[PDB]
């Protein structure tokens, strides 16, 4: 089942700083009171994030190149965000992964499914409304997890695919700044390892409806573009990261 | 000393000449805990099996195969494993598991094979000559012969051309056997493709229902997630072993560790990226490893002209570890320990020194 | 500021030992820089070749620490020489020299 | 180790031995400069309990007797301001020998003059 | 300027920062030199006229 | 073959850094030296022999 929504209204996307956030542990090593130095896929400091709105009336759920990985921030609150399409065709041609956060649990599929052209889920004023998919036919992997989730929470995800393996980190953050994205550090901690094997060079945001024909609710993400630079993370005496330089951003880093 | 210096005749002092190694002596292997196995009770302990046309194809992924508690069962009289050996599937690991399963006769197993010939391989279920997989069978008169005769259970009789390997035919089109169309009407020279096999208890043993489950492994440019069981040999601790966790290898000595990892940390390394810390699998605690304790060993002597005795050094090698002093250079053995303080003759190290008196530090 | 160069020299010597360990992660064109990985995925005809890679790479290495060792203590010898001298002209004597 | 490493290694010959040759060497080396440098004298040489030198003070560089170490507050200030088949070997000298040498040599530059440099 | 020589490069480890700190230790080693020989005033003394 | 072109020229610079660095400990000890003798012969009076 898909519908078609048609009462949207026209506006250019927003662009805002990415100050110095989207730093995610580069591998699974503990390092204690150390500075580390690593070349890796990495969100440039102060960097032009592109700004999506969902309000009412705003519904921004377009299909977006994947490049080498996506940082993808939330300042959500009632949880209107619950998934992610991943995809290269995003038809029955190809192969497309399934991220969805429904009313119980988080479901990753590899399937080749068959997308709507305007996706997404719908709470009742209780969720009662699936429109996202028509049809799956070949599944080479499925995995049911534990859920992953003024704006009072802000979500961060880093979606990287290497070598066939899709890393999901995430960070969830208390906030409560109203409009745009605090300013401040927060290490992203690796969530889960997903080995998909699958080419993957588009995306698209999951929303919710609310029904009462259709309402926004009130939510905000940014999407970041993942580059293959050098970061020098400083590790405290627990173990976490509180600090980052940015190489390539300014000769003081440098 | 002598092998060293390539001399018979040594002059007064200390000479380092080999170098103290702790041998590694136990291996310890530990993978994670043994959790999410693959769904084999649902394909060989199943209800009811799927007809050899019809034949079921289960896709396994994403858990732990343990394959010799399918090899150790004294309930399969056929085991025949094609492109691989049974003992070493146990240690591979697979990007997919294809599990077909359909039930045939007694006289039809031998088809089932890579390079065979008969109905079964023409027309019902066709193997590749390139083949990795194991054919696993067994006897079915208990569950799938009755009294009246069970015809629940059909096979492909008749087809244009052969299958192609891992194909499905269910079509139930009538096969034209002659110039004349069929027109959907089973007459002269238009037979039915699909004939029953009326298993019964009282058949012979090549006439027998058997169950055949076909096991293929193919290894695919994904991610390879089909392993099997890695076993956990009892952790040893404040002994110098050889250690594997989680594909980390290395030698040390494994002690306990106050360093608090946060839960998604494993591994911990130093300044210099070498790792001093680990968290074991099985049970979530944290271990130092302690390089084991490699010294250099050095002699002290006297000249070959006044004596032969002579004392061993192992430096930076505590005693219990190896007239025995300990010194802050490292443990000595076979030099008296004195109160005396003299002049420095032999340089041990650390306000250590060796003279001859018997040895004396 | 005052003590920089015992410091300078500790700090260098630090270093010097931090990259002589740094070197063993790297593979010098082999497939790995472990060997326990290089003699469990390959058989010993090409495994050969790659633990002799790692050893010349790690050879290269080990006499380019012992070198810069030697010229580093080749300059603290002519330090020490130095403060051998000062210690018996400025502290057991009177020295005239200037400076 | 690995022993098949160590088996290719012996093909290389003795560059072993040299290395380890030109380690020892500098590890000695730096011994004879503490030697040549602090050692410069075999009578250890104390000052007088009393302290009466005509009004000059030498507190701050003779040894504190309150601190375990025996150094002076300057040598005490010094040393807190400085901060694989790898071993690190001892230094044949002490700190405290170190420090016990430069007391005798400020003792016999102190109750001495340049004598005790030239002789009794 | 060959990206592939780099890559290829970056294999072998920290030979370049080492080379590139030796000959940066020279070249301060040079000015010290100088300043050790040539500075031993800090007054500009001039001639009568 | 960048391989071989690079082991040839990271030994050819090995040797002209190893070569720069005795070269620059010898320039240092007559460096010292002219200091010495600007401190003592042209800041002084030198009792020292030749
Ligand atoms: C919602 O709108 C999209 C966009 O037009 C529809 O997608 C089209 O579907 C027709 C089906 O006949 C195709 O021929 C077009 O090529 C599609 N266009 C695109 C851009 O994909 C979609 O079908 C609409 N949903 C419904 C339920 O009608
Ligand atoms: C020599 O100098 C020391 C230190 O400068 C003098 O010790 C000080 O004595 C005064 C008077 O009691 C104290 O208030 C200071 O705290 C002392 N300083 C230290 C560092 O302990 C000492 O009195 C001087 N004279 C003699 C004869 O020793
Ligand atoms: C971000 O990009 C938009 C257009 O893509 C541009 O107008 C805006 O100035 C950019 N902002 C910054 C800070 O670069
Ligand atoms: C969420 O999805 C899973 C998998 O499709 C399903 O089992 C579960 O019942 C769903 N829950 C709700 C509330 O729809
Ligand atoms: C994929 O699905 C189509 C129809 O759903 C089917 O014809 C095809 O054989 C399937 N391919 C695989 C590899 O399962
Ligand atoms: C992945 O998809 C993109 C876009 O469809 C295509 O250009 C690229 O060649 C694909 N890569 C692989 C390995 O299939
Ligand atoms: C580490 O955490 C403890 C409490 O968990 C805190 O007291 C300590 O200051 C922390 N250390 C650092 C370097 O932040
Ligand atoms: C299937 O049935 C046999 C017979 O009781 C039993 O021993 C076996 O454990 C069952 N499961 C599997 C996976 O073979
Ligand atoms: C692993 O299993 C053992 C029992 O075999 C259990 O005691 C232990 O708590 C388990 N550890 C984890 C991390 O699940």
């Given at each position: 089942?898909?519908?078609?929504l048609?009462?949207?209204?026209?506006?250019?996307?927003?662009?805002?700083?990415?100050?110095?956030?989207?730093?995610?542990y580069?591998?699974?090593?503990?390092?204690?009171?150390?500075?580390?130095?690593?070349?890796?896929?990495?969100?440039?400091?102060?960097?032009?994030?592109?700004?999506?709105?969902?309000?009412?009336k705003?519904?921004?759920?377009?299909?977006?190149?994947?490049?080498?990985?996506?940082?993808?921030?939330?300042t959500?609150?009632?949880?209107?965000?619950?998934?992610?399409?991943?995809?290269?065709?995003?038809?029955?041609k190809?192969?497309?992964?399934?991220?969805?956060?429904?009313?119980?649990?988080?479901?990753?599929?590899?399937?080749?499914?068959?997308?709507?052209?305007?996706?997404?889920?719908?709470?009742?004023?209780?969720?009662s409304?699936?429109?996202?998919?028509?049809?799956?036919?070949?599944?080479?992997?499925?995995?049911?997890?534990?859920?992953?989730?003024?704006?009072?929470?802000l979500?961060?995800?880093?979606?990287?695919?290497?070598?066939?393996?899709?890393?999901?980190?995430?960070?969830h953050?208390?906030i409560n700044?109203?409009?745009?994205?605090?300013?401040?550090?927060?290490?992203?901690?690796?969530?889960?390892?997903?080995?998909?094997?699958?080419?993957?060079?588009?995306?698209?945001?999951?929303?919710?409806?609310?029904?009462?024909?259709?309402?926004?609710?009130?939510?905000?993400?940014?999407?970041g573009?993942?580059?293959?630079?050098?970061?020098?993370?400083?590790?405290?005496?627990?173990?976490?990261?509180?600090?980052?330089?940015?190489?390539?951003?300014?000769?003081?880093?440098? | 000393?002598?092998?060293?210096?390539?001399?018979?005749?040594?002059?007064?002092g200390?000479?380092?000449?080999?170098?103290?190694?702790?041998?590694?002596?136990?291996?310890?292997?530990?993978?994670?805990?043994?959790?999410?196995?693959?769904?084999?009770?649902?394909?060989?302990?199943?209800?009811?099996?799927?007809?050899?046309?019809?034949?079921?194809?289960?896709?396994?992924?994403?858990?732990?195969?343990?394959?010799?508690?399918?090899?150790?069962?004294?309930?399969?009289?056929?085991?025949?494993?094609?492109?691989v050996?049974?003992?070493?599937?146990?240690?591979?690991?697979?990007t997919n598991?294809?599990?077909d399963?359909?039930?045939?006769?007694?006289?039809?197993?031998?088809?089932?094979?890579?390079?065979?010939?008969?109905?079964?391989a023409?027309?019902?279920?066709?193997?590749?000559?390139?083949?990795?997989?194991?054919?696993?069978?067994?006897?079915?008169?208990?569950?799938?012969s009755?009294?009246?005769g069970?015809?629940?259970?059909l096979?492909?009789?008749?087809?244009?051309?052969?299958?192609?390997?891992?194909?499905?035919?269910?079509?139930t089109?009538?096969?034209?056997?002659?110039?004349?169309?069929?027109?959907?009407?089973?007459?002269?020279?238009?037979?039915?493709?699909?004939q029953?096999?009326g298993?019964?208890?009282?058949?012979?043993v090549?006439?027998?229902?058997?169950?055949?489950?076909?096991?293929s492994?193919?290894?695919?440019?994904?991610?390879?997630?089909?392993?099997?069981?890695?076993?956990?040999?009892?952790?040893?601790?404040?002994?110098?072993?050889?250690?594997?966790?989680?594909?980390?290898?290395?030698?040390?000595?494994?002690?306990?560790?106050?360093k608090?990892?946060?839960?998604?940390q494993?591994?911990?390394?130093?300044?210099?990226?070498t790792?001093?810390?680990?968290?074991?699998?099985?049970?979530?605690?944290?271990?130092?490893?302690?390089?084991?304790?490699?010294?250099?060993?050095?002699?002290?002597?006297?000249?070959?002209?006044?004596?032969?005795?002579?004392?061993?050094?192992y430096?930076?090698?505590?005693?219990?570890?190896?007239?025995?002093?300990?010194?802050?250079?490292?443990?000595?053995?076979?030099?008296?320990?004195?109160?005396?303080?003299?002049?420095?003759?032999?340089?041990?190290?650390?306000?250590?020194?060796?003279?001859?008196?018997?040895?004396?530090? | 500021?005052?003590?920089?160069?015992?410091?300078?020299?500790?700090?260098?010597?630090?270093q010097?030992?931090?990259?002589?360990?740094?070197?063993?992660?790297?593979?010098?064109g082999?497939?790995?820089?472990?060997?326990?990985?290089?003699?469990?995925?390959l058989?010993?005809?090409?495994?050969?070749?790659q633990?002799?890679?790692?050893?010349?790479?790690?050879?290269?290495?080990?006499?380019?620490?012992?070198?810069?060792?030697?010229?580093?203590?080749?300059?603290?010898?002519?330090?020490?020489?130095?403060?051998?001298?000062?210690?018996?002209?400025?502290?057991?004597?009177?020295?005239?020299?200037?400076? | 180790?690995?022993?098949?490493?160590s088996?290719?290694?012996?093909?290389?010959?003795?560059?072993?031995?040299?290395?380890?040759?030109?380690?020892?060497?500098?590890?000695?080396?730096?011994?004879?400069?503490?030697?040549?440098?602090?050692?410069?004298?075999?009578?250890?040489?104390k000052?007088?309990?009393?302290?009466?030198?005509?009004?000059?003070?030498?507190?701050?560089?003779?040894?504190?007797?309150?601190?375990?170490?025996?150094?002076?507050?300057?040598?005490?200030?010094?040393?807190?301001?400085?901060?694989?088949?790898?071993?690190?070997?001892?230094?044949?000298?002490?700190?405290?020998?170190?420090?016990?040498?430069?007391?005798?040599?400020?003792?016999?530059?102190?109750?001495?003059?340049?004598?005790?440099?030239?002789?009794?």
């Open positions: 089942q898909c519908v078609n048609t009462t949207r209204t026209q506006l250019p996307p927003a662009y805002t700083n990415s100050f110095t956030r989207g730093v995610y580069p591998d699974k090593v503990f390092r204690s009171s150390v500075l580390h130095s690593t070349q890796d896929l990495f969100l440039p400091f102060f960097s032009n994030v592109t700004w999506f709105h969902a309000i009412h705003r519904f921004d759920n377009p299909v977006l190149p994947f490049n080498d990985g996506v940082y993808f921030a939330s959500e609150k009632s949880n209107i965000i619950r998934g992610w399409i991943f995809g290269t065709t995003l038809d029955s190809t192969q497309s992964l399934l991220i969805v956060n429904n009313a119980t649990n988080v479901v990753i599929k590899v399937c080749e499914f068959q997308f709507c052209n305007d996706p997404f889920l719908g709470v009742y004023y209780m969720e409304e699936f429109r996202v998919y028509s049809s799956a036919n070949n599944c080479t992997f499925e995995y049911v997890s534990q859920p992953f989730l003024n704006f009072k929470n979500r961060e995800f880093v979606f990287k695919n290497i070598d066939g393996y899709f890393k999901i980190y995430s960070k953050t208390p700044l109203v409009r745009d994205l605090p300013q401040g550090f927060s290490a992203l901690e690796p969530l889960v390892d997903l080995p998909i094997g699958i080419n993957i060079t588009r995306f698209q945001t999951l929303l919710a409806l609310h029904r009462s024909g259709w309402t926004a609710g009130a939510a905000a993400y940014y999407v573009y993942l580059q293959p630079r050098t970061f020098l993370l400083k590790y405290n005496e627990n173990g976490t990261i509180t600090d980052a330089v940015d190489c390539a951003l300014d000769p003081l880093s440098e | 000393t002598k092998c060293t210096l390539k001399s018979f005749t040594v002059e007064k200390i000479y380092q000449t080999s170098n103290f190694r702790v041998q590694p002596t136990e291996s310890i292997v530990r993978f994670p805990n043994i959790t999410n196995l693959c769904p084999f009770g649902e394909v060989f302990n199943a209800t009811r099996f799927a007809s050899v046309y019809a034949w079921n194809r289960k896709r396994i992924s994403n858990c732990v195969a343990d394959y010799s508690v399918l090899y150790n069962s004294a309930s399969f009289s056929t085991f025949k494993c094609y492109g050996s049974p003992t070493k599937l146990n240690d591979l690991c697979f598991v294809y599990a399963s359909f039930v045939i006769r007694g006289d039809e197993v031998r088809q089932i094979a890579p390079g065979q010939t008969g109905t079964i023409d027309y019902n279920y066709k193997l590749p000559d390139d083949f990795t997989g194991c054919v696993i069978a067994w006897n079915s008169n208990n569950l799938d009755k009294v009246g069970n015809y629940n259970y096979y492909r009789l008749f087809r244009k051309s052969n299958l192609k390997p891992f194909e499905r035919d269910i079509s089109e009538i096969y034209q056997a002659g110039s004349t169309p069929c027109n959907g009407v089973k007459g002269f020279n238009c037979y039915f493709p699909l029953s096999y298993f019964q208890p009282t058949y012979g090549g006439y027998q229902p058997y169950r055949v489950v076909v096991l492994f193919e290894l695919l440019h994904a991610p390879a997630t089909v392993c099997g069981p890695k076993k956990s040999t009892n952790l040893v601790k404040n002994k110098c072993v050889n250690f594997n966790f989680n594909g980390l290898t290395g030698t040390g000595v494994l002690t306990e560790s106050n608090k990892f946060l839960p998604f494993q591994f911990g390394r130093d300044i210099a990226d790792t001093d810390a680990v968290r074991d699998p099985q049970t979530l605690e944290i271990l130092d490893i302690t390089p084991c304790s490699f010294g250099g060993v050095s002699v002290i002597t006297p000249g070959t002209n006044t004596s032969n005795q002579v004392a061993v050094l430096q930076g090698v505590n005693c219990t570890e190896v007239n025995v002093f300990q010194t802050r250079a490292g443990c000595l053995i076979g030099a008296e320990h004195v109160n005396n303080s003299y002049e420095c003759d032999i340089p041990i190290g650390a306000g250590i020194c060796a003279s001859y008196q018997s040895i004396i530090a | 500021s005052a003590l920089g160069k015992l410091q300078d020299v500790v700090n260098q010597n630090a010097a030992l931090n990259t002589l360990v740094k070197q063993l992660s790297s593979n010098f082999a497939i790995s820089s472990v060997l326990n990985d290089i003699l469990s995925r058989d010993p005809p090409e495994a050969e070749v633990i002799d890679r790692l050893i010349t790479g790690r050879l290269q290495s080990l006499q380019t620490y012992v070198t810069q060792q030697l010229i580093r203590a080749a300059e603290i010898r002519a330090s020490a020489n130095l403060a051998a001298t000062k210690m018996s002209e400025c502290v057991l004597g009177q020295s005239k020299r200037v400076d | 180790d690995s022993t098949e490493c088996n290719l290694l012996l093909q290389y010959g003795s560059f072993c031995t040299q290395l380890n040759r030109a380690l020892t060497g500098i590890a000695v080396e730096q011994d004879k400069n503490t030697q040549e440098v602090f050692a410069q004298v075999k009578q250890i040489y000052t007088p309990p009393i302290k009466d030198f005509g009004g000059f003070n030498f507190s701050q560089i003779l040894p504190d007797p309150s601190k375990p170490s025996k150094r002076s507050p300057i040598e005490d200030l010094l040393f807190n301001k400085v901060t694989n088949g790898l071993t690190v070997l001892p230094p044949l000298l002490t700190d405290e020998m170190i420090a016990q040498y430069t007391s005798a040599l400020l003792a016999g530059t102190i109750t001495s003059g340049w004598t005790f440099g030239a002789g009794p």
